Design a protein around this ligand. Structure first.
Ligand SMILES: CNc1nc(NC2CCN(Cc3ccc4c(cc(C#N)n4C[C@]45C[C@](NC=O)(C4)C5)c3C)CC2)c2cc(CC(F)(F)F)sc2n1
Length: 466
């Protein structure tokens, strides 16, 4: 509106007052995305971007928030003439979605760093004319809500955002850019990306938000970071309390990564009487299995990262094996580089460092070490197997020799007597990838044949002539 009922809690003087506003909006037929994003962006600005003069909490006065809200609605309503886009059947047209996208896009500053922190909210859009990639998609949805377009909703993969709209909510439209140096596809469907089985479009198992999930998205989008070394405790608390509010209302049920975010916040500062982080990570994985065909990678990464921080090598390896079992059924496509980077860093930095410490602890007499557990060797092998299977049939390759030395080193952290205990069948493990099937006979030698492993992992045809 803003409607009278939306104004009664102002001024917001504390974290808890912001939570009360979110609770009130989430109890309405349609929570007001523009109001909520402006409030979060205002408090984030004064808690993380500029803390000069902060004494407790940046009071959000109604006059200030209402003026920002009016700037947004005036910009959208003045620029989008709905009479040019008649709404057949109470649903929106592709041309109307494209117009809203164009209005947001054309408002942005001509040159700025797109990966900056704190450019996600409508506060940033209004005051700085800057948005990050997914911020543009959220702003399009908020503008559509402000215009009365109840069918336009945010769609989210694990690395991109777009909109759904139209009859039955069945149309898709790109509304923002993805990554750096890719060609704009605004206004097009996501069908080519779904059909090519890229990770970017999740084989179609992406999130189709309702309004409550769009509120969850903006809460996950809070960025508490003040600088590289410092987070705002106030914004961490706000994000944590808002995620618990959403959790209790059922609005995280279909949002795996939000459950992982909540688990990470609980690990940092547990809330008495709430579930443990592990329970929450497992709920995020359950959500992905239940609603998204177990086609998401990050729920397992969140779990693996917790185990890795807790130096629980066995369960970290299991969770990484599970990430690879998801990725194996994708084709590695152009624009999937973010997930390639995660696997590369896990394989070639994180696992090596974890196993190096495990080896030192084993030398010092550790008992029950992952390095003496053949099931942990099997998890390592299953991790590589899924990456090799991912590569099969893909338009771009995954493995190269820069992976091969780390594989040889990690395999060799397990003594041959441990490695011998895994039965590879066509502790028991079955390989899905042809690369790992051919590597089987190299996996039990006391001194692994490093050159042969490298040949098998990279499918290198030849050794040096001379
Ligand atoms: C909360 N809601 C939420 N979150 C989203 N993305 C989150 C994805 C996970 N990251 C953290 C992160 C990043 C890498 C990690 C782990 C855990 C592990 C593990 N193991 N790794 C791999 C590592 C270990 C490494 N190296 C040294 O340690 C990092 C390699 C973790 C938790 C934070 C953002 C998105 C994206 C959307 C699409 C958009 F809208 F944006 F278009 S919607 C949306 N919603």
């Amino acid at each position: 509106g803003l409607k009278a009922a939306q104004k009664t809690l102002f001024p917001l003087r504390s974290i808890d007052d912001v939570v009360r506003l979110f609770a009130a909006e989430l109890g309405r037929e349609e929570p007001d995305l523009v109001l909520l994003s402006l409030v979060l962006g205002f408090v984030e600005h004064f808690l993380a971007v500029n803390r000069v003069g902060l004494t407790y909490f940046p009071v959000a006065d109604l006059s200030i928030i209402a003026a920002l809200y009016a700037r947004f609605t005036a910009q959208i309503r003045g620029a989008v003439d709905l009479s040019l886009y008649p709404r057949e059947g109470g649903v929106s047209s592709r041309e109307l979605v494209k117009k809203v996208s164009d209005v947001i896009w054309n408002s942005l500053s001509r040159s700025y760093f797109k990966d900056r922190a704190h450019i996600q909210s409508l506060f940033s859009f209004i005051t700085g004319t800057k948005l990050d990639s997914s911020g543009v998609a959220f702003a399009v949805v908020g503008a559509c809500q402000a215009l009365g377009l109840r069918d336009v909703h945010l769609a989210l993969s694990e690395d991109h955002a777009w909109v759904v709209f139209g009859p039955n909510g069945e149309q898709t439209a790109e509304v923002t850019w993805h990554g750096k140096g890719n060609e704009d596809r605004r206004g097009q469907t996501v069908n080519a990306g779904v059909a090519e089985r890229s990770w970017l479009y999740l084989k179609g198992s992406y999130m189709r938000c309702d309004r409550k999930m769009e509120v969850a998205f903006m809460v996950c989008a809070i960025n508490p970071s003040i600088d590289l070394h410092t987070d705002s405790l106030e914004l961490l608390q706000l994000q944590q309390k808002l995620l618990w509010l959403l959790y209790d209302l059922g609005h995280l049920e279909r949002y795996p990564m939000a459950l992982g975010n909540l688990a990470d916040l609980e690990e940092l500062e547990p809330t008495p009487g709430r579930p443990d982080p592990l329970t929450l990570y497992h709920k995020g994985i359950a959500s992905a299995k239940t609603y998204y065909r177990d086609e998401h990678i990050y729920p397992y990464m969140y779990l693996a990262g917790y185990h890795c921080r807790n130096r629980n090598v066995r369960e970290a390896l299991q969770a990484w094996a599970d990430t690879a079992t998801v990725i194996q059924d994708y084709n590695y496509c152009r624009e999937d580089e973010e997930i390639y980077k995660e696997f590369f860093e896990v394989a070639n930095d994180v696992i090596p460092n974890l196993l190096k410490e495990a080896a030192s602890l084993l030398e010092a007499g550790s008992q029950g070490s992952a390095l003496q557990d053949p099931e942990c060797f099997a998890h390592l092998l299953r991790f590589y197997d899924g990456i090799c299977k991912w590569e099969e049939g893909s338009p771009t390759p995954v493995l190269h020799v820069g992976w091969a030395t780390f594989l040889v080193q990690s395999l060799g952290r397990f003594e041959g007597q441990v490695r011998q205990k895994v039965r590879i069948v066509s502790p028991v493990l079955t390989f899905q990838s042809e690369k790992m099937k051919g590597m089987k006979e190299l996996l039990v030698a006391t001194k692994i044949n490093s050159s042969a492993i490298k040949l098998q992992l990279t499918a290198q045809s030849q050794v040096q002539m001379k």
